[PDB]
């Protein structure tokens, strides 16, 4: 009897439509529908987002061009959007952030003597495996690990910064393969780059 699972499933979806209510977005929105003032007191408590507030479909998309941009301040201004601290919906327990795309990772500027003296060393578990590895060696070898190492220490390294680590999309080429949500260029507030 396939009609048991199918037809009772569509009856459960039908009463999901009849009992439950949708969650309206926060755009040109007033305080309450007249149904909402009869419901819970969501005013005097702190606003906490529901599942229809942090959908990854309608998140923002940002594209920087990392040509002649210095690394760490770009990493901080990518971090401040990768968290969601430019949105008034910022709750630090959910994923309110925005996807970012960093093209031209091969041409990221640094200041001083970072290129020959800053080491991206790593180590496995056994002794004597500490890998000597400098900035020009990655930028010659795999450049898109540079920025990916800069912003990974900018995000809260628990279960939630690991989830918004995948929002970072760094590509070394001049062109990114994304045409997802027509990615608008990233707004900067940094006068010294």
């Amino acid at each position: 009897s396939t009609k048991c699972t199918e037809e009772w499933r569509q009856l459960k979806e039908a009463v999901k439509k009849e009992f439950a209510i949708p969650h309206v977005p926060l755009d040109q929105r007033w305080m309450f529908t007249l149904e909402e003032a009869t419901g819970p007191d969501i005013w005097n408590t702190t606003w906490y987002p529901k599942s229809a507030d942090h959908v990854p479909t309608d998140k923002k998309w940002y594209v920087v061009d990392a040509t002649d941009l210095i690394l760490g301040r770009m990493a901080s201004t990518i971090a401040i959007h990768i968290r969601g601290k430019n949105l008034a919906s910022y709750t630090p327990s959910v994923d309110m952030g925005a996807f970012v795309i960093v093209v031209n990772a091969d041409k990221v500027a640094v200041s001083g003597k970072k290129r020959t003296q800053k080491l991206y060393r790593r180590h496995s578990g056994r002794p004597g495996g500490l890998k000597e590895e400098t900035f020009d060696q990655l930028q010659k070898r795999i450049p898109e690990r540079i920025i990916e190492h800069a912003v990974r220490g900018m995000l809260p390294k628990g279960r939630l910064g690991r989830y918004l680590f995948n929002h970072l999309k760094v590509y070394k080429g001049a062109e990114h393969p994304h045409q997802a949500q027509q990615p608008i260029d990233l707004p900067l507030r940094d006068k010294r780059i």
């Binding site: 305080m31 005013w43 601290k85 430019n86 949105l87 008034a88 910022y90 709750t91 707004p187 507030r189």
Partner: protein, 115 residues
């Protein structure tokens, strides 16, 4: 004059009933039921004082992220510059609540802070 009793089992059964959903021998085993009652109550203390502190922090960063959407360099400190110079006594960071429940009304707040 023997004095066998039952009061340790009501004394102990109340603490047993409070220690529900403690994941294992913290929810079944008496000699840990006691210290999970104890540590649960002091957890309630420090997380209550720091829920006052923590929601203060949350409204500070929420209205900071609301004001910084103008683009021109208007920080959260300047919103309090011209929030106490223009005499608005103590909106108590509940403008961080109507900053998302009523974003046009907080645009009226800030656009009357400018003038």
């Amino acid at each position: 004059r023997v004095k066998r009793g039952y009061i340790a089992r009501r004394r102990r059964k109340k603490i047993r009933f409070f220690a529900s959903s403690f994941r294992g021998a913290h929810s079944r085993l008496t000699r840990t039921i006691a210290q999970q009652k104890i540590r649960a109550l002091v957890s309630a203390h420090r997380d209550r004082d720091r829920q006052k502190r923590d929601f203060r922090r949350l409204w500070i960063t929420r209205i900071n992220a609301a004001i910084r959407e103008r683009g021109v360099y208007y920080n959260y400190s300047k919103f309090i510059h011209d929030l106490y110079k223009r005499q608005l006594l103590l909106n108590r960071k509940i403008l961080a609540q109507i900053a998302i429940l009523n974003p046009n009304c907080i645009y009226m707040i800030y656009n009357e802070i400018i003038k």
